[PDB]
Symmetry: D2
Subunit: 497 residues, 4 copies
């Protein structure tokens, strides 16, 4: 687990001591989010994806119908619960709804035309010289000389435009208006229906597209209402305004997605890494989950092995400190969905061992405010203990997940076994790095003491069965003093029985 | 130039302060190496590549003849010298010879056979099948394959995309099952991870290629599949007296090379992290560990390191890179690579110029994002104390460069060494290396931050005036390139007497 | 308050620049105060006032006095201590320390008048005994019968003020030149820097004194002139089974002890930097080096270290210390001494109470001035990885203490160990160590930040209730002492089971 | 040697654990030694031995003595100094410091008579001049006419270095006080009124006469007593006028107000003295170390000289060896980063003035080796502002080089001192040989740590280049003769590009010839 490197006095010496022959621990801390689609929506494929390490099933509402998504969610649940007969080896799987959001698109039976460089193409609110799109106000917000991007930014341009970068035009392609004054509501009537559908389907989180300000986050939250109040809102930062207004967005949100696809069109591609590292750093500092997304293993759509760049990108997103990494096309429509999941799992474990925890822990603690929240004090202390004894795990009894989130913030090397009886908490926990959620099914014991002890033993059995630790190893256990929530204040250092 | 981020007390706060609206300086410090091939070998394309930011022309001797490469070298020189009429705007371009080394290749089927998962394939060295490869029988050039592989061994073909498992071993054949299928073409690369592969690091062919390199006056050799220090010594010995100044860059592309990296780094002038072969020879998820390890060790040693292969791979076919590719180039610079390299992108890609420009843009951004506070401290703490007055002058100049936020460090250098000593300490400011030696001007591109300039003015009579002339030349270059303006402060490194190896004078001077 | 503005600084320099005399320190005083008891301080009334002023340990110097004299002194210390036992909340345990005579060389009799030694003059040194009471300017007797055999050499007399160089030596005789002259009186101490002494580290006299110590139920032994680990083992062996819990503090007061410090530190319960003899045995200008070295190594080991001798020397005769003395006490605390010690100041001085109060005041100020940011980091980086659950619990507690700026760390401890483990990590907040063991309550004063409290309540049947009772006791103490108020947060350390060595539970709790 | 093993530690804790008493320090001693001259030390022969033992600055305490007495003392200092002037390689500049009386309160005459004040006894205090020479155990006169206005019932009055303490019981023309701490009371002892608001001028008519005398006597620096605000420093500077404009003003911080207004005082001053005597009476004694460490840290940050003063080796007035506390105090003042350390009674009136000088020299060299330069250089760097001053950039770069090659010295050609002061600010381990032709610059340079001033007497050469080389060679000869470095060793050399001041911009790393 790169322990030789972990004991270096400088980051440079740490890098010099990284050893390919030093195997990582069994635990994988970084959550894996997989977009489900044609390639991956069958129950059998989903079982293999869960086996390969999928933690969250992402549903992309830019496409498909409520029917198609309902069936997909049913299949995800069927695949998940197929492992429910053994609670020790069960793995919670979360469901994420990704909103369409303010998408501009062009005008299943699809043909494509060839747009040529130098040619003039007119835009109107399906072929060379006339192109229709759904944004009725385009003519107001753009000027001649502004760029218009079409089909993941591959094509670049009444509206009279010249084709700067041509290609196949297709149908119903997404458009980017680089920081034009686009007035499309952050929550459209379509989004409202999709969010309500999400609340009915009992989704764990919403990935809200094209969030530009705090008000947008409040709109999403308001639409979810009382019934959806526990659904996590992850704001996708995918334009210049969202990056400029990141602080107010981060305050209003439950977490963040660095949505690098749109972002790399909306801002110069060479600057995306700056925005990524900035958002991850700020989320780490805030203790709120951050997802690195889009084109992480893109070539695996068509190839059984990633490029060297892709391998580097996944590793660096984990070293930057992403809580989750995400597959899009790779798992939704790729020829190698299982290989993609396995590849993310392998790279994440390696990168996790290669984290300079000495510096990370210090900096995290120095930038955290002093507080008289007893749970926060307990969390940081537990992480310290975890390091001091090189503990096999941190076991956390949590009902809402908050206690486990507080531990996760301080980035322990050891996995955080979060024991809960709340299924939603067990699913949502995957948003946080190092949180290994376990769903206790055992009936409530008679003495609260005994109910606590039993939940701990559950965790001990899971850690043993998963090869996180052995009998005689030391683990950290976090409990409360009083039944109920927000009373986590007890840390114990105990041998595994 | 991310100055707000550069003043953070913690790396975390540094990251939180990275600002997309903070534009980088004009200077680009990381060298760009471009593989030359069919897409890029024309004089016109080469002119545009130099304009776009190419610093080193890499020639891949895995392919082509001496004739083909001689013409390529001539074209590179023609394109380079087309800008020589203005020494202020001239850019030296280095030539790199990349050796074939112990390559294993398949036979001939352009034709492709479709391999299906589960299907049987037989491997043979019998030349009867050299040009009769198909979905049932595959010939390869490694005559001793049957000796070094066992039942259960993997054989990887075509950049590791096709994978075969040995099921039965014969006297002169293998029966294999296709684990990962796909299209199999002609003359594809074969990797035998964990096999006992018995092939010389320097073949008789490599010896001829190296001799040709010495005749052609190449600046550096990228030596393939270096596994131990002895391999580097073989290359060095083959170059002889005439080639003694050619830089040997060892390509680390297998398990053994990574394990013996210290002895290799000692024996070599520099390193290339050759991630293509490396990502097949070791698990792909470990490549980043090997990369970061080698870069860190090279930086500590003050020897050049190149990050190579598939940095902007998708740009072979697309005018824009993936998000992963953008991140990879940035992270290689942040890791502290001296140079970044394009392979297929420039050799055979549809967008060679865009690829060069993209590396130039990402490198400048990543260079601004370096946490110099920590980097400079750590570098100094891990460098040994020396009696060498030039080492002390260098470190002092880098410190001063920081202290006054200098526009550049101007270094008068004959052999490169003084500028290399400055480069080791990673100043933010560009190092304008003034030389009259053309080879030094070319070779200087291997080091980060070294902007080499070739003074052609005759040696003036008063040594002090010969010095002033060369400093003024660098001032004119920096002004014309928009590195600094009149009134700005720069650092100047000179020697106390004529010759090489007497650099000991640092001056802080206004730009005139 | 408590210089917390300074504690937030990113650099030690900025920390120093932020030290504020107008920022008043917390009520708690963490550094133990050891006072030598003698003619000025042995009365019950004076002892009561010394306890009030802040005395934690009563040191008995066995270089002087009889068993009778010391027994009465111990009785008086106990009488004074127990006079406050009627209120367990406001009671303060007081430890008794026996300081051994050890291998002392002393001069003969001149009445108690003096001769004048002149620089350059010859002096004879003799062990004859015929000159035992006839010492003069020509002949000096001493009790070390083996002197003429171990010297070849400088000889120091009377606190190192008189210095003699051996000019010529015979058996039974020695001739010296007076290098530094002065007034020589009767029965002065002799030091032989280097000049390897054969005297036993534990003499027959020391054996009797140690046995007396065991009979009197002393808490700790300060063992004089420890030179090696074997010496520490001899002391430990002499104490036997009955004395097994008595702490052995090795006094490091010669060059050999400093050179063999690691083996001594391993064998001992703690260390005293005995600067008197040490500043004669090694050049005075090097004592600070030895002090800082020993304190640093003790802190790193988690074993108590005492800074001793001449800390407030001028207060023997003056009601206020010098500026140097004020600085010395502050720097000993900043170096990280667990205890500071008064010798002549309290034993024989005119102002024993003022001396105790002065140490109390300076210690509190210096404790607020501690750069906890760097100290805690360095402490953790130099501490070994262990599977001791109590060690992991302790460090975690100290982190928590910082994170919430807790008013105290409450520790239930039977042997002291758990509270010692907390103390090692140097929390700012006071460590309220609740015990029912009186010896543990006394011995705890050897460790910085440990405020020992002696619970007298009977053991409850329900272990949980017995724990709660003891925690409540500590809450009452902290409230009454003004360490914290109702609603404040404190850290509580408990074990999971009755017994010793099971501390593993940390709670963050409001004060009720 | 020179605690190099300790200097390479990754942490300050490990650095402390690696301090080795058997590791000898380098020959060079970087911390300036200031000695108060008086009855014990004013002879030419004693002064020669003090210079030999390591005295850098002769401090004259104008709280005592006459102009005549001090003029003779200055003459003697000069005579002793110039006795070594025939060899410029082995000559050592010695500075003269005038320490002002400042707003003191002093008691009357009992001259050299004493009374015994007993604890619990009543003592009457009076400003009535009738008792000015009739002080006794019952009535004590003092010179502060307004005392009765500024003190209250319960106030403390401290007399004679705070050794005698009186509590005001009754206020009248008089105060009735109870003696809390008694002892022997002599004539003309200092009085402190902690927490009172004393209206006395920072520069009294006496101070004005003493300052004028100082300008006539060509003193190098003024130690200005009881500075409370920047305006006080401006008063001193104004009194010195055009003729005294180059004299360095060192503000003595010795009261609560001075500590609170330290930043404005530090801005206005050439440097600072932590005057711990009065300070430890004016503020609680247990806080003096906080004020000391604060002022030293801030002076280091500013690049202005700081002196640690008073009672550093006090017991050596009467004893040939210091206490253990005194040894520790000197070492810690150097570790804190004082530029100079100071002897008062030890050298002025003590029985062992030479031993005291030698002891400060020894302890300073040891403490200098024990500095954790790794952390100190980094922090100094991270706290210094970015500037476009080429001399500042050259200075820091030189210090870096000095460390990189473990240079034997940094040779600096300086006319005003400034370039050498800029080097000193970054605290190189290597000694700074400051070559000047200006004698006052050579004397004033001792205020800065590591600056070893050398006074070139050679005529100015016609070729500027040769005049530079001559001065560099002079420094090479000095460093060789002083055992700072040997032939073949590396040194750093700082020069300017043109004749004049404020042109230092050239650094060279050169072998010693
Ligand atoms: O003997 C001692 O304790 C001393 O020298 O301090
Ligand atoms: O006046 C002084 O020097 C003092 O009080 O230290
Ligand atoms: Mg999107
Ligand atoms: Mg004064």
């Amino acid at each position: 687990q790169q322990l030789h490197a972990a004991m270096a006095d400088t980051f440079l010496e740490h890098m010099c001591r990284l050893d390919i022959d030093s195997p990582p621990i069994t635990a994988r801390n970084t959550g894996i989010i997989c977009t489900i689609g044609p390639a991956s929506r069958s129950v059998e494929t989903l079982k293999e994806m869960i086996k390969s390490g999928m933690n969250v099933a992402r549903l992309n509402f830019s496409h498909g119908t409520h029917e198609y998504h309902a069936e997909t969610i049913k299949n995800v649940r069927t695949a998940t619960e197929s492992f429910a007969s053994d609670p020790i080896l069960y793995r919670p799987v979360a469901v994420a709804l990704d909103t369409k959001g303010p998408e501009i698109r062009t005008g299943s039976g699809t043909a494509e035309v060839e747009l040529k460089k130098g040619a003039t193409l007119k835009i109107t609110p399906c072929d060379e010289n006339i192109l229709w799109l759904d944004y009725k106000n385009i003519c107001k917000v753009v000027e001649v000389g502004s760029k218009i991007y079409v089909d993941d930014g591959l094509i670049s341009l009444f509206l009279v435009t010249e084709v700067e970068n041509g290609g196949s035009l297709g149908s119903k392609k997404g458009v980017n208006l680089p920081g034009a004054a686009v007035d499309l509501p952050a929550v459209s009537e379509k989004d409202i229906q999709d969010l309500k559908f999400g609340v009915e389907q009992d989704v764990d989180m919403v990935f809200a597209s094209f969030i530009r300000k705090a008000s947008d986050v409040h709109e999403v939250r308001k639409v979810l209402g009382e019934k959806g109040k526990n659904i996590k809102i992850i704001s996708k930062i995918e334009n210049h305004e969202g990056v400029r207004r990141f602080d107010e967005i981060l305050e209003a949100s439950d977490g963040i997605m660095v949505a690098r696809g749109d972002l790399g069109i909306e801002i110069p591609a060479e600057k995306v890494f700056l925005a990524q590292k900035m958002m991850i750093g700020r989320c780490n500092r805030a203790g709120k989950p951050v997802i690195c997304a889009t084109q992480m293993l893109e070539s695996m759509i068509k190839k059984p092995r990633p490029t060297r760049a892709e391998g580097s990108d996944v590793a660096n997103a984990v070293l930057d400190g992403a809580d989750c990494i995400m597959l899009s096309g790779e798992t939704a429509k790729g020829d190698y969905p299982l290989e993609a999941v396995r590849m993310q799992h392998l790279i994440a474990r390696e990168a996790e061992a290669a984290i300079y925890h000495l510096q990370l822990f210090e900096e995290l603690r120095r930038l955290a405010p002093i507080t008289s929240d007893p749970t926060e004090a307990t969390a940081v202390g537990a992480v310290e203990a975890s390091f001091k004894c090189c503990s096999g795990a941190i076991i956390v009894l949590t009902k809402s997940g908050r206690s486990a989130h507080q531990v996760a913030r301080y980035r322990p090397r050891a996995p955080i076994i979060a024991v809960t009886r709340n299924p939603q908490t067990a699913r949502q926990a995957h948003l946080y790095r190092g949180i290994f959620p376990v769903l206790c099914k055992d009936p409530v014991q008679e003495a609260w003491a005994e109910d606590v002890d039993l939940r701990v033993n559950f965790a001990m059995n899971v850690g043993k069965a998963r090869g996180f630790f052995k009998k005689g190893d030391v683990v950290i256990v976090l409990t409360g003093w009083r039944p109920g929530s927000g009373f986590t204040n007890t840390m114990r250092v105990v041998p595994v029985p």
